[PDB]
Design a protein around this motif. Structure first.
Motif, PDB file in Angstrom:
ATOM      1  N   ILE C 118     -23.003   7.521 163.142  1.00 29.69           N
ATOM      2  CA  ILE C 118     -23.638   6.911 161.982  1.00 29.69           C
ATOM      3  C   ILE C 118     -22.622   6.874 160.847  1.00 29.69           C
ATOM      4  O   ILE C 118     -21.648   7.630 160.829  1.00 29.69           O
ATOM      5  N   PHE C 119     -22.843   5.960 159.905  1.00 29.88           N
ATOM      6  CA  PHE C 119     -21.934   5.756 158.787  1.00 29.88           C
ATOM      7  C   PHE C 119     -22.721   5.585 157.498  1.00 29.88           C
ATOM      8  O   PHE C 119     -23.835   5.048 157.512  1.00 29.88           O
ATOM      9  N   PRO C 120     -22.172   6.034 156.373  1.00 30.24           N
ATOM     10  CA  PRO C 120     -22.817   5.794 155.081  1.00 30.24           C
ATOM     11  C   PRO C 120     -22.282   4.531 154.429  1.00 30.24           C
ATOM     12  O   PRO C 120     -21.125   4.146 154.656  1.00 30.24           O
ATOM     13  N   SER C 122     -20.592   2.122 151.696  1.00 28.54           N
ATOM     14  CA  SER C 122     -19.486   2.342 150.780  1.00 28.54           C
ATOM     15  C   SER C 122     -19.929   2.116 149.334  1.00 28.54           C
ATOM     16  O   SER C 122     -21.000   1.565 149.061  1.00 28.54           O
ATOM     17  N   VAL C 134     -24.724   1.455 159.471  1.00 33.92           N
ATOM     18  CA  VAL C 134     -24.310   1.087 160.820  1.00 33.92           C
ATOM     19  C   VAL C 134     -24.551   2.268 161.751  1.00 33.92           C
ATOM     20  O   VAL C 134     -24.204   3.407 161.421  1.00 33.92           O
ATOM     21  N   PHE C 210     -27.950  11.553 158.376  1.00 35.54           N
ATOM     22  CA  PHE C 210     -27.221  11.949 157.180  1.00 35.54           C
ATOM     23  C   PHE C 210     -28.091  11.722 155.951  1.00 35.54           C
ATOM     24  O   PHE C 210     -28.929  10.814 155.916  1.00 35.54           O
TER      25      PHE C 210
END
Ligand code: A1BIL
Lengths: 226, 120, 212, 415
Positions: C118-120, C122, C134, C210
Motif C-alpha cells: 500500500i502507498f500513501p 503524496s 494505490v 496505514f
C-alpha cells in the motif's frame, strides 16, 4: 501481385463530425470481388460493418450503421469509400476491409481469406493536456526485509500514448508499467512501480522520467523514502 | 452445511503410498473447487493442491509437484488425494477445504477437520 | 444473422497436450463455418474453412469437424507459438456473416501467492487536487484475485481503477494495480486506509493498512 | 430281421392303401412347366433369375425320375425288387442314392443363391470385379458333381441302404446296427453337413437383410428430407408477401439445396467422382441456387417484392432437373426389396422342411433303445422321406404366385 487492402483516412475527430475511410485494394479488380468492412473495438471481438458489390452495384449495411454510413466504390480508381456522418461515443475502433468471391465454385466457400491492417478511429470532446506526476513513498510505519516498493503515477494527459521509464531504463529488474485507463473526464492515467531489496527502505532516491509527444512534455520525478 | 469428511491412513514408510478421501455432506462439487492443505507444529497452513471444474485441469503447489495426484468424482461428489514416493517430512494434519466463488476466488469458509499422518 | 456460441472463454494448458474448442450455430448453416486466429494487436487470420477443410499454409495441428450443428476445432500438439485468441464465424449470405465471442489459451504453472503493498498519497496530490491511494499485488498465479478497499469499517464501492498486466515472460505471473482516486476532502476527512486481498492459493487474506 | 422287418418283402400292403402321388406329380409338372415358360420367355431364356431357373430345371428333372417308379411299383403290387429283375437290390440302392443326391444338390444351390445375393448387395467392387455370368450359370454342374462324389461312398467303401415300410421306400440306414465304424459315420455326417449348409444360408440371408436397410436409411436421410424442405419452403413463400419472411425462407432453401447437393443415388455410388450422372445433379442444384441468389439480391435487397417469377422459375427448375434421379432410385430400391423377399421364402421352405430327417438321424446315432415297432412308431422315416419329397412340389408354385402382380403389391403397400 499480393492481395493487399491498404487503408487511409484515420484520425481524431469531434463527436457529430464526418469522416471518409478509403480502402484501396491491390492485385485484383474491385468489380470481381465483393468488399466488406469489419471493425474491432479496443480489446473486444470482431464486428462486420457494410457490404458493397461493384458488378451489380448492390449495397447493404449493418443495423447500427445504416442511414448514417454510406458505402461506395469507383472502378476507375479501384477504391472503396465509407462515409461516416453521425459519430457517437461508441465508435472508437480499428477498421479494416476484407474481400470475398462470387457464387459458384471455390471462391465463395473461402470467406475472408484476406483482411486489412486497420486504421484507428477516435471520437472525443477533449483537447491536448499535460500530465501531473506524483511519487509513491514506501510506508515507514512497518516494513519487511527485501520488500521495499517504489513507483510514480502520471495522471490527466491526452491523447494516448505516453512513455514512462525508470532511471533512463537502467533499472528494469522488477518494473511493472500498467496499461493506461480512460477516466470519466476523458483523459488517461498510468502508474509505474518497482520492487527493491529493503536496505532500510532502500535508503536511496530514484528518478522516473515521463515524456508525452503531442503536448511536448518531459517530467523527471525523484522518489525518496518517507 | 458443507461438512467435508476426510479419511486416510496414519502410518506409512518412505517410498510408500497413501489415499486420502474427502467427501461432501450433501452439496454438489460441480459448482465449487476443492483444496488440500497441510498443518504442522511450528509451521503454517501451506497450500498443497486445488481441483477445479472438469475440463479446466488442476493445480499443485511447489512442494508436491509430481508426487500428489488429485482426482474428482461427481457421482460420489468426492475427491481423492493419492500420495506416492513419500518422505519423513510430510508428517502433518491434512485438511480439505472448499471454495465459495464460481470465478475461482479463494473463500475458504468450509474446512475439513483433518487427518493425522505420521511417517518415519 | 445467426449466432455462434463459443465456450470456454479461457483455458490453461501445458505444452504438448491436445485441446478442443466447440462452436455451436443457432440454426443449420450447412457446412460454411470458419475459424480465425488473432494475436493481440494484429489482424485475424483464417485457419479452417468449409467447417472441415484446411486453409493453405495453416499447420496440420489444427483440425475441424462437423457433427450436425456442432463444430469442433482441435489442436493436437500445442506448440509455444499457439497462445492466441480464436474465433468462429458463420457465413450464409453476403449480408449474413456473424463472428463468435472468442477464447484464449494460456500457460500452465504452479500456484504462487501475491505480495501486497500500500502507498500513501503524496503532498502535491493532496494539495493540488484529488488524492489517489494505490494497492499493489506484485506477483501471483493464476489470474484470479479479489482486492477490497476499507476506510473506517466502510466498504468502498465508489472508486476503482484496477489494471491487470498480461502474462510475464519470465515467471508467467499476473500483476495487478488497484487505484482509488477520490478527492482531497475525503482524504483528509478520514485516517485509516486498508486493503484486503484474497487469492486462490491462500488460506487467509492479506491486509495492508496505514493511518494518517 | 429284428430291425427293419420289411426287407425283400413281396407284399406291399403293409404301409398304406391310398393313391395321392399322381395328383402331386401332375401339379408339380404343370407348375414347373408354367414357371419355366414364364421365366424363359420374358427374360429371353440377372444372375439371380438364372440361379432360380437352374434350380427349377433340376427339381423338374429330379421329381420325374423318382415319382413314376414309386407309382408303378405301387400299381403292380410288387416291391422295389420284385417288379423288375434287379438282382441283389439293384434298384433300392439306386432309389436311395438318387434321392440323397438330389436333396444335397438342391440345398447347395439354395446356399449358392443366398451367398451370391449377399455378395452382390454387400461389396459392389468385389461383385463387379470377380463374379461374372458364367460363374453364376455354372453353379449346378459342380454342385451335382460334389453331391455325387459325396454320395458314392458305399460303392468304393461301406454304406448301408435299407428299405423302410412300405414295400418301396429306400434310404440310408440309421438305427440298430449295434455299432460299426462305417455305418454311423455317414448317418451322422449327412445331418451334420445339412445343418451346416442351412445355417450358412440363414447367416447370408440375415446379412443381406441388414445391408439394404442401411442403404434405404442412407437415401431417406440424404435426399428426401431435403426435397421435402425445398417443397415446403416454396409453398410457404407464395402464401405471404411480407418483406421479412422472403429472405430467411430463401436462405433456408439455400441451406437445404447445399445439403442436397452432397447426396448420392445407389448405383451412382459405384463411381461418385467425375460422374456425368452426378455432374448433372450438381449442375441442376447450381442453377437452383443461382436462381435463389438472383431472387435474394435483385428483388429483396430493396423492399420491392415481386418474388413470383423467381418462384415459378424455381418450380420449373425442380420439375425439369431433379425428379428423374429420385424416381429411378425409388424403382431400384423396390426391385431389390422384391428380389430379397423372393429369396427369403425359398430359404425358409428349404430349412423348415429338413428338421425331421436331421433330428431322426441324430436320434438314431447317440440314443439307443434298440427296439423296433415301439408303440407302432416307425413312421418317422416315412415323414422325413415324404417331406424331403414334398420340397419339390411346392418350390415353383410359390415363385409363380409371388410373381403374379394381382396381389403381390397390394399386400406390400397395405402391410
Ligand atoms: C418320390 C418323390 C421324389 C421327388 O423328388 C425326386 C428327387 C429326390 N427328392 C426327394 C428331391 C428333393 C428335393 C429336390 C429334388 C428332389 O429330386 C418328388 C416327389 C413328389 C416324389 C413323390 O412321388 N413323393 C410323394 C410324397 C408324398 C406322397 Cl403321399 C406320395 C405318394 C404316396 O406316398 O402314396 C409321394
Amino acid at each position: 501481385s499480393e492481395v493487399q487492402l491498404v487503408e487511409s483516412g484515420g484520425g481524431l475527430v469531434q463527436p457529430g463530425g464526418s469522416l471518409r475511410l478509403s480502402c484501396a485494394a491491390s492485385g485484383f479488380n474491385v468489380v470481381d470481388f465483393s468488399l466488406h468492412w469489419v471493425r474491432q473495438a479496443p480489446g473486444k471481438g470482431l464486428e462486420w460493418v457494410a457490404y458493397i458489390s461493384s458488378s451489380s452495384g448492390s449495397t447493404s449495411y449493418a443495423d447500427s450503421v445504416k442511414g448514417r454510413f454510406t458505402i461506395s466504390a469507383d472502378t476507375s480508381k479501384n477504391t472503396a469509400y465509407l462515409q461516416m456522418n453521425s459519430l457517437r461515443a461508441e465508435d472508437t475502433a480499428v477498421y479494416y476491409c476484407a474481400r470475398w468471391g462470387y457464387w459458384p465454385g471455390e471462391p465463395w466457400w473461402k470467406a475472408f481469406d484476406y483482411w486489412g491492417q486497420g486504421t484507428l478511429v477516435t471520437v472525443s470532446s477533449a483537447s491536448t493536456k499535460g500530465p501531473s506526476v506524483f511519487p509513491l513513498a514506501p510506508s515507514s510505519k512497518s516494513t519487511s526485509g527485501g520488500t521495499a516498493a517504489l513507483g510514480c503515477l502520471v495522471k490527466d494527459y491526452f491523447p494516448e500514448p505516453v512513455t514512462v521509464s525508470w532511471n533512463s531504463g537502467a533499472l528494469t529488474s522488477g518494473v511493472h508499467t500498467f496499461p493506461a485507463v480512460l477516466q470519466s473526464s476523458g483523459l488517461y492515467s498510468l502508474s509505474s512501480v518497482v520492487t527493491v531489496p529493503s536496505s532500510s527502505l532502500g535508503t536511496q532516491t530514484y528518478i522516473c522520467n515521463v515524456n508525452h509527444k503531442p503536448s511536448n512534455t518531459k517530467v523527471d520525478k525523484k522518489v525518496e523514502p518517507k | 452445511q458443507v461438512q467435508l469428511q476426510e479419511s486416510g491412513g496414519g502410518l506409512v514408510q518412505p517410498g510408500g503410498s497413501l489415499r486420502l478421501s474427502c467427501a461432501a455432506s450433501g452439496r454438489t462439487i460441480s459448482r465449487y473447487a476443492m483444496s488440500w492443505f497441510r498443518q504442522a507444529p511450528g509451521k503454517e497452513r501451506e497450500f498443497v493442491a486445488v481441483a477445479r471444474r472438469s475440463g479446466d485441469g488442476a493445480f499443485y503447489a511447489d512442494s508436491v509437484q509430481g508426487r500428489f495426484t488429485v482426482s474428482r468424482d461427481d457421482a460420489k461428489n468426492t475427491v481423492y488425494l493419492q500420495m506416492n514416493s513419500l518422505k519423513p517430512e510430510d508428517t502433518a494434519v491434512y485438511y480439505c477445504a472448499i471454495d465459495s466463488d464460481t470465478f475461482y476466488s479463494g473463500s475458504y469458509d468450509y474446512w475439513g477437520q483433518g487427518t493425522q499422518v505420521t511417517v518415519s | 444473422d445467426i449466432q455462434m456460441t463459443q465456450s470456454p472463454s479461457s483455458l490453461s494448458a501445458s505444452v504438448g497436450d491436445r485441446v478442443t474448442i466447440t462452436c455451436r450455430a443457432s440454426q443449420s448453416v450447412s457446412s460454411a463455418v470458419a475459424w480465425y486466429q488473432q494475436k493481440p494487436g494484429k489482424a485475424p487470420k483464417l485457419l479452417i474453412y468449409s467447417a472441415s477443410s484446411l486453409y493453405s499454409g495453416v499447420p496440420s495441428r489444427f483440425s475441424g469437424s462437423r457433427s450436425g450443428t456442432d463444430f469442433t476445432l482441435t489442436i493436437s500438439s500445442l506448440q509455444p507459438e499457439d497462445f492466441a485468441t480464436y474465433y468462429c464465424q458463420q457465413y450464409l449470405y453476403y449480408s449474413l456473416v456473424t463472428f463468435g465471442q472468442g477464447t484464449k489459451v494460456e500457460i500452465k504453472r504452479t500456484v504462487a501467492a501475491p505480495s501486497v503493498f500500500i502507498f500513501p498519497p503524496s503532498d502535491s496530490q493532496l494539495k493540488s487536487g484529488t488524492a489517489s491511494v494505490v494497492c499493489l499485488l506484485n506477483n501471483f498465479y493464476p489470474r484470479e484475485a479479489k482486492v477490497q478497499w476499507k476506510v473506517d469499517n466502510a466498504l468502498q464501492s465508489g472508486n476503482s481503477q484496477e489494471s491487470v498486466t498480461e502474462q510475464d515472460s519470465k515467471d508467467s505471473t499476473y500483476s495487478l494495480s488497484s487505484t482509488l482516486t477520490l478527492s482531497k476532502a475525503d482524504y483528509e476527512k478520514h485516517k485509516v486506509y486498508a486493503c484486503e486481498v484474497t487469492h486462490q492459493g491462500l488460506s487467509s487474506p492479506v491486509t495492508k493498512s496505514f493511518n494518517r | 430281421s429284428p430291425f427293419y422287418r420289411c426287407q425283400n418283402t413281396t407284399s406291399v400292403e403293409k404301409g398304406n392303401s391310398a393313391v395321392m402321388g399322381g395328383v402331386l406329380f401332375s401339379t408339380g409338372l404343370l407348375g414347373n412347366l408354367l414357371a419355366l415358360g414364364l421365366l424363359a420367355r420374358s427374360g429371353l431364356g440377372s444372375v439371380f433369375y438364372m440361379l432360380v431357373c437352374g434350380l427349377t430345371v433340376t427339381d423338374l428333372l429330379g421329381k420325374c425320375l423318382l415319382s413314376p417308379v414309386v407309382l408303378a411299383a405301387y400299381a403292380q403290387n410288387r416291391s422295389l425288387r420284385v417288379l423288375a429283375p434287379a438282382l441283389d437290390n439293384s434298384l433300392c440302392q439306386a432309389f436311395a442314392f438318387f434321392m440323397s443326391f438330389f436333396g444335397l444338390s438342391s440345398t447347395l444351390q439354395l446356399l449358392a443363391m443366398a451367398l451370391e445375393r449377399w455378395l452382390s448387395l454387400g461389396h459392389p467392387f468385389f461383385y463387379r470385379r470377380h463374379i461374372t455370368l458364367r460363374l453364376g450359370a455354372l453353379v449346378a454342374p459342380v454342385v451335382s458333381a460334389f453331391s455325387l462324389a459325396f454320395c458314392a461312398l458305399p460303392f468304393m467303401g461301406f454304406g448301408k441302404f435299407v428299405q423302410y415300410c412300405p414295400g418301396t421306400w429306400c434310404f440310408i440306414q440309421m438305427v440298430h446296427e449295434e455299432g460299426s465304424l462305417s455305418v454311423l459315420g455317414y448317418s451322422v455326417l449327412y445331418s451334420s453337413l445339412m445343418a451346416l449348409l442351412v445355417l450358412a444360408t440363414v447367416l447370408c440371408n440375415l446379412g443381406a437383410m441388414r445391408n439394404l436397410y442401411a442403404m434405404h436409411r442412407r437415401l431417406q436421410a440424404d435426399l428426401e428430407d431435403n426435397w421435402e424442405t425445398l417443397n415446403d419452403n416454396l409453398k410457404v413463400i407464395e402464401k405471404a408477401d411480407n418483406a421479412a419472411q422472403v429472405k430467411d425462407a430463401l436462405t433456408k432453401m439455400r441451406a437445404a439445396a447445399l445439403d442436397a447437393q452432397k447426396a448420392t443415388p445407389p448405383k451412382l455410388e459405384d463411381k461418385s467422382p467425375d460422374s456425368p450422372e452426378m455432374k448433372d445433379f450438381r449442375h441442376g442444384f447450381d442453377i437452383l441456387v443461382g436462381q435463389i441468389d438472383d431472387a435474394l439480391k435483385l428483388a429483396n435487397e430493396g423492399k420491392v417484392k415481386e418474388a413470383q417469377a423467381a418462384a415459378e422459375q424455381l418450380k420449373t427448375t425442380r420439375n425439369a432437373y431433379i425428379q428423374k434421379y429420385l424416381e429411378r432410385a425409388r424403382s431400384t430400391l423396390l426391385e431389390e426389396l422384391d428380389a430379397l423377399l423372393l429369396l427369403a421364402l425359398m430359404t425358409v421352405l428349404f430349412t423348415m422342411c429338413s428338421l425331421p430327417v436331421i433330428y431322426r438321424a441324430y436320434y438314431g446315432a447317440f440314443k439307443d433303445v434298440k427296439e423296433k415297432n415301439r408303440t407302432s412308431e416307425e413312421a418317422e422315416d416315412l415323414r422325413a422321406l415324404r417331406f424331403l419329397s414334398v420340397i419339390s412340389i411346392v418350390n415353383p408354385w410359390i415363385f409363380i404366385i409371388f410373381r403374379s402382380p394381382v396381389f403381390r403389391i397390394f399386400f406390400h403397400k397395405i402391410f
